[PDB]
Design a protein around this ligand. Structure first.
Ligand code: NHW
Ligand code: 646
Ligand code: CL
Ligand code: MG
Length: 385
């Protein structure tokens, strides 16, 4: 595979190896003055569209495009189905720009056929803090694949991010591109095991009968940390200190302001779940997970897999194992079928004892225009949506 597009870009070549002594841009001294003011050209019959994510109709068009054309599993049974309310939350964080929510319409039918988006955040990479763009939800309609529209969308969002004097981005993908700074597998913890088997997400074996699998994944409906409760606005300062202080140990992590903590953590039903343990007016433990369902295609019984994805979890009054056992419990109480986590932060250490199973492939973390040492995923301290 040649990466004829990617090799024109400020990113590492497949064989590039940098020491820990290197931690800087590939291209520095960039000038907002010099950024191209013209939109990149689209094939005949197609146009840029500025998406207003706070307009329910524009949002619903993005929602439809992703519902029909986003990430599918290797066998093509499952397709991610981010909710409209989810997309609102994911793309209207503090200081977001409307002009980084970019669609492409096919003129003749006025239908949206392409999308890419970014949001601004401060990213600390090997102890340097850089204002970056966080790029997500790149999607080209399934009918228009391998026509090189993705590189158009990418060069256009790059241009619009550069116009804000920002020159670095972070992004994740399942595909291998030049070149991951880290690489983390998904692990899956079955909650509704019979449904997971019936939809073909998990399996059994003569060793393991349906009843025995159900017993294996059975959980006690009692928290290790008995006062774990939904987060509220009063807990923003406390979570800002607990999470902020925790994250500083990692090689890569978002440096959250208090406004960002409110946005990213305050709970939204069917979007984001954050629980806290408050002890003497201090927040001492937190659990958070987000809702990302998969549409189940062509099943007579089920149309939706409800999945909870581990987001940020910190404990100071229990073991990490006990905290994540509580996270699984909290996802079960909210009627989630499976709890997913990446082998980042301290997550791997709990996967065997908590009966997680290893997933297929992995999620690659990337930076744009940044040269640095790569590292093991335990050193990663950021989870993108
Ligand atoms: C300073 C600011 C900088 C801002 C930008 C930072 C960079 C942000 C980068 C974006 C981060 C997104 C992160 C994200 O959203 C989360 S990862 C999920 C991405 N979305 C999907 O998988 C949805 C299902 N697939 C599709 O919609 C299409 O297959 C897409 C649109 C993905 C590719 O459409 P297509 O019809 O299949 O392909 P062509 O148009 O013919 O394009 C082929 C070229 O596309 C390169 N490609 C393929 N998949 C990619 C991927 N996931 N990242 C980056 N590049 C990807 C590919 O390597 C090749 O270049 P090469 O010839 O060099 O290999
Ligand atoms: C049930 C189901 N529904 N679908 C759609 C799939 C693929 C599955 N199978 S899975 O659950 O076992 C699983 C899971 Cl959770 C996640 C990844 C993974 C791979 C690559 N990229 C991303 N992202 C890209 C951008 N940020 C969002 C995450 C996720 C792969 C698998 Cl295979
Ligand atoms: Cl060009
Ligand atoms: Mg294409």
């Amino acid at each position: 595979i040649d990466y004829k597009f990617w090799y024109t870009q400020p990113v590492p070549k497949i064989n590039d190896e940098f020491n820990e002594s290197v931690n800087e841009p590939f291209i520095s001294d960039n000038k907002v003055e010099d950024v191209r003011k013209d939109e990149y050209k689209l094939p005949p019959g197609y146009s840029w569209y500025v998406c207003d994510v706070k307009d329910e109709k524009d949002r619903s068009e993005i929602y439809t495009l992703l519902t029909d054309n986003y990430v599918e599993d290797d066998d093509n049974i499952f397709r991610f189905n981010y909710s409209a309310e989810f997309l609102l939350w994911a793309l209207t964080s503090p200081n977001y720009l409307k002009t980084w929510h970019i669609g492409v319409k096919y003129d003749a039918s006025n239908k949206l056929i392409g999308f890419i988006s970014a949001i601004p955040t401060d990213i600390c990479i090997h102890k340097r803090t850089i204002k970056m763009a966080e790029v997500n939800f790149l999607c080209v309609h399934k009918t228009l694949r391998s026509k090189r529209l993705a590189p158009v969308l990418i060069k256009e969002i790059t241009r619009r991010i550069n116009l804000e004097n920002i020159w670095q981005a972070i992004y994740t993908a399942g595909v291998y591109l030049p070149k991951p700074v880290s690489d983390a597998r998904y692990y899956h913890r079955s909650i509704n095991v019979k449904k997971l088997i019936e939809i073909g997400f998990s399996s059994l074996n003569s060793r393991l009968t349906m009843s025995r699998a159900i017993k294996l994944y059975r959980v006690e409906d009692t928290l290790n940390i008995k006062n774990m409760r939904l987060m509220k606005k009063k807990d923003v300062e406390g979570v800002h200190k607990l999470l902020g202080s925790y994250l500083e140990q990692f090689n890569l992590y978002a440096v959250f302001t208090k406004e960002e903590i409110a946005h990213w953590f305050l709970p939204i039903e069917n979007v984001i779940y954050t629980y806290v343990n408050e002890e003497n007016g201090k927040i001492k433990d937190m659990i958070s997970f987000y809702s990302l369902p998969s549409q189940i295609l062509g099943n007579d019984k089920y149309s939706t897999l409800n999945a909870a994805y581990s987001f940020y979890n910190v404990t100071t009054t229990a073991t990490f194992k006990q905290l994540m056992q509580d996270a699984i419990l909290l996802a079960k109480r909210n009627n989630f079928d499976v709890f997913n986590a990446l082998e980042v932060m301290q997550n791997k250490s709990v996967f065997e004892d908590l009966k997680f199973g290893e997933g297929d492939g992995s999620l690659k973390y990337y930076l744009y225009n940044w040269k640095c040492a790569s590292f093991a995923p335990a050193h990663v301290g950021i989870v993108l949506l």
